[PDB]
Amino acid sequence: EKRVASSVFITLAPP
Amino acid sequence: SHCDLSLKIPEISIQDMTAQVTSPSGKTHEAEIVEGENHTYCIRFVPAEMGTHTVSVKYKGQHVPGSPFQFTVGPLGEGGAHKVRAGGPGLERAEAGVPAEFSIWTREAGAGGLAIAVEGPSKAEISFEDRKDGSCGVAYVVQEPGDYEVSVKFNEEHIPDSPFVVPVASPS
Secondary structure, eight states, rough: OOOOEEEEEEEOOOO | OOEEEEEEEETOOOOOOOOOEEEETTTEEEEEEEOOSEEEEEEOOOOSSSSSSEEEEEEEEHHHOOOOOOOOOOOOSSSOOOGGGEGGGGGTTTTTSSSSHHHHHHOOOOOOOEEEEEESOOOOEEEEEEEETTTTEEEEOSSSEEEEEEEEEEETTEOOOOOOEEEEEOOO
């Protein structure tokens, strides 16, 4: 039962 | 006072060690190294940016074993992960091979770093859509059916109801 990670990051700007 | 990284390294001396931190913007900065108990060195950096930072650590000009290291920063203790909300079908149920979609509302948290992770029996392809209406669209596609955990974090703190457990079926 294999478990892999995938992840992304987003820079959130001042609104 | 948080040691962004600690390294136990015998029979070196701190005055010949260098720790250079690269931020997501590509800016580099020199980290402070202090020697704790044992020969355990605390590497500390005050970040101006959120996200994963890289640190090269060299002794007498040579990378130490393990270098380059990376670490993630946050949270800041100012709010704010708790002000983010996420929801949609892609956080409830999905099908293998089919975009599983959801939204994230980040406007109340303000500036920071948003991380989306998908863990399970295959690698996810993740899509981001910036919208001018205060929300982010996210979609992911995973090839294999199974139970996936979808994590949404702001400055490395999970937002309310993260991590989401998502059963992914074969399409039908």
